[PDB]
Design a protein around this nucleic acid. Sequence first.
RNA 1: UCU
Length: 75
Amino acid sequence: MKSRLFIGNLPLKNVSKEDLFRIFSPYGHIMQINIKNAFGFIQFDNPQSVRDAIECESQEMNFGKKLILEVSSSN
RNA sequence: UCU
């Protein structure tokens, strides 16, 4: 557990899994990407990748905004 | 701000 990243505020249009892959692939090997409207879920193969993504990408602009990035709690 |  703890190997999934939650994104809380994606734009509601014009967002692809590939966009998310380009942003988050530097942090580790991504196994799965799910988008449910404003919510993104990126499954890595380990929990450190999620922590690294939150620490580095929270400081960045993506899709013209500051993304809400968290350890995913979703079952 | 959790399919």
